[PDB]
Enzyme design. Structure first.
Site, PDB file in Angstrom:
ATOM      1  N   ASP A 103       0.850  -1.187   0.000  1.00  0.00           N
ATOM      2  CA  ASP A 103       0.000   0.000   0.000  1.00  0.00           C
ATOM      3  C   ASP A 103       0.889   1.241   0.000  1.00  0.00           C
ATOM      4  O   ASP A 103       2.026   1.187  -0.465  1.00  0.00           O
ATOM      5  CB  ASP A 103      -0.979  -0.035   1.203  1.00  0.00           C
ATOM      6  CG  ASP A 103      -2.231   0.792   0.961  1.00  0.00           C
ATOM      7  OD1 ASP A 103      -2.190   2.020   1.185  1.00  0.00           O
ATOM      8  OD2 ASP A 103      -3.260   0.247   0.521  1.00  0.00           O
ATOM      9  N   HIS A 135      -3.706   6.255   3.690  1.00  0.00           N
ATOM     10  CA  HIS A 135      -4.433   5.087   3.200  1.00  0.00           C
ATOM     11  C   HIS A 135      -3.920   3.830   3.900  1.00  0.00           C
ATOM     12  O   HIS A 135      -4.691   3.136   4.563  1.00  0.00           O
ATOM     13  CB  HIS A 135      -4.326   4.991   1.673  1.00  0.00           C
ATOM     14  CG  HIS A 135      -5.244   3.983   1.061  1.00  0.00           C
ATOM     15  ND1 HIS A 135      -4.790   2.797   0.525  1.00  0.00           N
ATOM     16  CD2 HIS A 135      -6.590   3.982   0.894  1.00  0.00           C
ATOM     17  CE1 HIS A 135      -5.812   2.114   0.041  1.00  0.00           C
ATOM     18  NE2 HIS A 135      -6.918   2.806   0.261  1.00  0.00           N
ATOM     19  N   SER A 295     -11.048  -1.220  -0.325  1.00  0.00           N
ATOM     20  CA  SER A 295      -9.814  -1.418   0.441  1.00  0.00           C
ATOM     21  C   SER A 295     -10.106  -1.782   1.904  1.00  0.00           C
ATOM     22  O   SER A 295      -9.572  -2.760   2.420  1.00  0.00           O
ATOM     23  CB  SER A 295      -8.955  -0.166   0.407  1.00  0.00           C
ATOM     24  OG  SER A 295      -8.274  -0.068  -0.827  1.00  0.00           O
TER      25      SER A 295
END
Ligand SMILES: [Ca+2]
Lengths: 355, 9, 13
Positions: A103, A135, A295
């Site tokens: 990620d 994120h 996600s």
């Protein structure tokens, strides 16, 4: 014979860089010999070329920066299976198990994940066109976070494949997947769960790498994608032996994300909570924020799978899949949100821990 | 809501 | 909305 492939989403293409994938049993020396051949034949025609990376472990082959003019030549090389133009991907209990996260950068000292996340030195990201790690940090927290995590006993390793805007490459993701397999061979531990909370267009090479990793006994969990579309058109979502996760909300609705929303269809294995998910905010060491996306849903499923694998470490991939399905809530999702022909193809499953 | 949904509480 | 502690989130929700 050898075929050429490039991303069907034209704005996601990255012309000038190619993944040359060699036949399955090709070993490193041959892959290197084939790369040097290409460079020499290219030079003979006046073309400059650079070998950026030679793959071995899952896929034999190499990454080359060169003019697309050379593709017909490259496709006649010995041992070539196919060639794929690089393209972009985008951000979308548990103690015996290691969860890998590919990620963005993460804030590893966030109090929610401090000491349970190990930042590997792996980084492969394209240049940009607190925020850099929003994120990844949130998703680390969803998996293993002290206050808001699904699997608090799970330990994570993080690789960086998405830049500060959440953008990576297929090639960078391949090298990351190879790095995971390499680390495993060097220093074996228990069951591995690899979380891929990203998506690009359908990629033959990315699906193949994921498939090989899965066949080698590693569990892969991915985001279905946030394009309100058929997940089979995206990778790694479409790689069959991966666990592909769509997103539902508190009302048991598939998630709307602006004008788009969760992907659906036959390539989705199940859904999990993916709207309004409280989790670690990298703004400060104790900060929390709510986020939405496939996600986050994938991260829930990676946490459930880590707990399940810790309880039953011998489970094969197919057995783990059966457990995830068996323990899901069934037929709670509003099927009318899906296109008419996709309702039967889309599994009406919301993931749950076993009580 | 999510942690309750997956049966963690 | 960023909460600066877990408890601030708990009071909010
Ligand atoms: Ca699957």
């Amino acid at each position: 014979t050898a075929t050429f492939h490039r991303c069907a989403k034209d704005p996601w293409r990255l012309p000038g860089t190619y993944v040359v994938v060699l036949k399955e049993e090709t070993h490193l020396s041959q892959s290197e010999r084939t790369a040097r051949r290409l460079q020499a034949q290219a030079a003979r025609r006046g073309y400059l070329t650079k070998i950026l990376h030679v793959f071995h472990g899952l896929l034999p082959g190499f990454l080359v920066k060169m003019s697309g003019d050379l593709l017909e030549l490259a496709l006649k090389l010995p041992h070539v299976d196919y060639i794929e133009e690089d393209s972009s991907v985008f951000a979308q209990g548990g103690s015996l198990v290691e969860v890998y996260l590919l990620d963005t950068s993460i804030q590893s000292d966030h109090r929610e994940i401090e000491g349970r996340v190990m930042v590997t030195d792996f980084e492969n990201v394209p240049e940009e066109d607190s925020k850099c790690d929003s994120h990844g940090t949130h998703l680390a927290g969803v998996v293993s976070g002290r206050d808001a995590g699904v699997a608090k006993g799970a330990s994570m390793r993080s690789l960086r494949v998405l830049n500060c805007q959440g953008k990576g490459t297929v090639s960078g993701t391949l090298i990351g997947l190879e790095f995971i397999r390499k680390s495993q061979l060097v220093q074996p531990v228990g069951p591995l769960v690899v979380l891929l909370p990203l998506a690009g267009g359908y990629s033959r090479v990315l699906n193949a790498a994921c498939q090989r990793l899965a066949r080698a006994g590693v569990v892969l969990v991915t985001a279905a994608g946030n394009f309100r579309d058929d997940a089979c058109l995206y990778s790694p979502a479409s790689a069959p032996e991966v666990i592909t996760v769509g997103a539902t909300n508190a009302q048991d609705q598939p998630v709307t994300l602006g004008t788009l929303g969760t992907n659906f269809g036959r390539c989705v294995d199940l859904f999990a909570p993916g709207e309004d998910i409280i989790g670690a905010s990298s703004d400060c060491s104790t900060c929390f924020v709510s986020q939405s996306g496939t996600s986050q849903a994938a991260a829930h499923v990676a946490g459930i799978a880590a707990m399940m694998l810790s309880a039953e470490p011998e489970l094969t991939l197919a057995e783990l899949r059966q457990r995830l399905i068996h323990f899901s809530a069934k037929d709670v999702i509003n099927e009318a949100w899906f296109p008419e022909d996709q309702r039967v193809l889309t599994p009406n499953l919301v993931a749950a821990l076993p009580p | 809501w999510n942690l309750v949904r997956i049966g963690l509480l | 909305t960023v909460f600066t502690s877990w408890e601030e989130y708990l009071d909010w929700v």
